[PDB]
Design a protein around this ligand. Structure first.
Ligand SMILES: Nc1nc2c(ncn2[C@H]2C[C@H](O)[C@@H](COP(=O)(O)NP(=O)(O)OP(=O)(O)O)O2)c(=O)[nH]1
Ligand SMILES: [Mn+2]
Ligand SMILES: [Mn+2]
Length: 430
DNA sequence: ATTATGACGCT
DNA sequence: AGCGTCAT
């Protein structure tokens, strides 16, 4: 009872940009704004592959991973923006630079954990304590939460979406105990006020809209963020978890959408996250390992301890290109030319990284996939990265992979290569 | 012939 | 170190 820690110590937010690459292109090209729009890479094969979709286009069924030609069958007026091509490959520099814009704004409010090109976690615990001090016990006005949903409300004792949002927010605020500076629900509410301010700053200073989740840990904050996109934020309280998880398919939790989540479902004969509560910690550890078992035992109760890491920058910088079907690399000249193309992009990104961030990569990882292998990587080899020079890096990558070529002929490459991947790792302060 | 990444756990 | 998983 009283000693049963409830994982309510922290206030954690997850901010995720809405249809991010689409918004970057819509900012640049006003003709694309407020339209069914998608971003594609390449064009020749089936119109290119869609990687981002505006909410207007999603209403027609357009999704990521869809070929543009098929998307056009669902949405004939779909507008398309193509990712830049440089050195024969997709070049995502524009979106990385836009990401840096957003991360630098978020960092004004708290130390952030960059989790992807378009999202970051925020530990707002200390900022919340400060704002609570400033409030001096003053209640929180609904006017300070103009885009916030409270998950699970309204309940009990109404036709429009905004009206439902305001009803739930009123029920939440009316039940708040604001004389207690240690009430977790109050702390979450102040966190949501701060996140409204952060999201307002992002939109004012970049033009980009985003959604967010506010809860007591990273997994619940990420889930919350998804609940009401686009352009809204959602508060998931500790008390909302039993109802939320009672119908939540296990795969919707981050980390359980693959083989492990399938094994939870099959071994235990359950469907929903809430059903996990009936098992002991030891039972879950016996099926899924000590670490996964403890994580599942806590997570189905709304509890997770993974910290928001103080990391605004990516840990690795990588360049990769697939060579599908008849485009697979089958000569030594081809392999060297594309290694050089990847290495040149890598050199340019690394040199800019060193200038901006006062650090140097020290290890080069070379990954390839060979024809007939379904795995992502057929082989990974590391070597030393001592100079930011594309010719040296491509020569070294060739040296570490060249023993892959089973062809006796010096010129041919067999079996052909369907992917090259260069990734710079192990950064040191320079 | 989804693609280009990036994080992280395991042994 | 190299591989596998999850993600998207
Ligand atoms: N190259 C590449 N980029 C991708 C891929 N998948 C996503 N991206 C890029 C394009 C995406 O814009 C961006 C962010 O990914 P999300 O947050 O998962 N999706 P979004 O922000 O579009 O919509 P929502 O409002 O639902 O969050 O990452 C991929 O497979 N390949
Ligand atoms: Mn997003
Ligand atoms: Mn995202």
């Amino acid at each position: 009872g009283p000693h049963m820690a409830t994982g309510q110590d922290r206030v954690v937010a997850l901010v995720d940009m809405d249809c991010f690459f689409v918004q970057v292109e819509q900012r640049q090209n006003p003709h694309l704004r407020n339209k069914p729009c998608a971003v594609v890479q390449y064009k020749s094969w089936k119109g290119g592959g869609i990687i981002a979709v505006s909410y207007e286009a999603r209403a027609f069924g357009v999704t990521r991973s869809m070929w543009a030609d098929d998307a056009k069958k669902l949405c004939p007026d779909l507008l398309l923006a193509q990712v830049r091509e440089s050195r024969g490959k997709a070049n995502l520099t524009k979106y990385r630079e836009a990401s840096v814009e957003v991360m630098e704004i978020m960092s004004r409010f708290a130390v952030i954990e960059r989790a992807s090109i378009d999202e970051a976690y925020v530990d707002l615990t200390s900022a919340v304590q400060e704002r609570l001090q400033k409030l001096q016990g003053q209640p929180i006005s609904a006017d300070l939460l103009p885009s916030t949903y409270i998950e699970g409300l309204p309940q009990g004792p109404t036709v429009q979406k905004e009206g439902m949002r305001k009803q739930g927010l009123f029920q939440w605020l009316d039940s708040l105990q604001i004389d207690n500076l240690t009430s977790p629900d109050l702390q979450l509410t102040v966190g949501a006020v701060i996140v409204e301010e952060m999201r307002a700053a992002i939109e004012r200073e970049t033009g980009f809209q985003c959604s967010a989740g506010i809860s007591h840990n990273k997994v619940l904050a990420k889930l919350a963020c998804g609940l009401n996109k686009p352009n809204r934020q959602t508060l998931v309280s500790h008390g909302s978890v039993p109802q939320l998880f009672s119908q939540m398919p296990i795969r919707k939790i981050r980390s359980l959408g693959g083989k492990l989540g399938a094994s939870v479902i099959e071994i235990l004969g359950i469907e929903y996250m809430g059903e996990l509560t009936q098992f002991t910690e030891s039972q879950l550890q016996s099926h899924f390992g000590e670490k996964n078992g403890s994580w599942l035992y806590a997570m189905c109760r709304g509890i997770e301890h993974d910290p928001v890491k103080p990391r605004q920058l990516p840990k690795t910088i990588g360049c990769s290109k697939n060579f599908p079907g008849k485009t697979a690399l089958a000569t030594r000249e081809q392999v060297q030319w594309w290694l050089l193309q990847l290495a040149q992009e890598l050199e340019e990104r690394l040199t800019k990284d060193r200038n901006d961030n006062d650090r140097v990569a020290t290890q080069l990882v070379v990954s390839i996939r060979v024809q007939g292998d379904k795995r992502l990587s057929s082989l990974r080899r590391c070597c030393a990265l001592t100079r930011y020079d594309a010719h040296k890096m491509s020569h070294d990558a060739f040296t570490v992979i060249k023993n892959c070529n089973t062809s006796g002929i010096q010129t041919e490459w067999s079996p052909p290569l369907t992917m090259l991947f260069l990734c710079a790792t192990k950064f040191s302060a320079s």
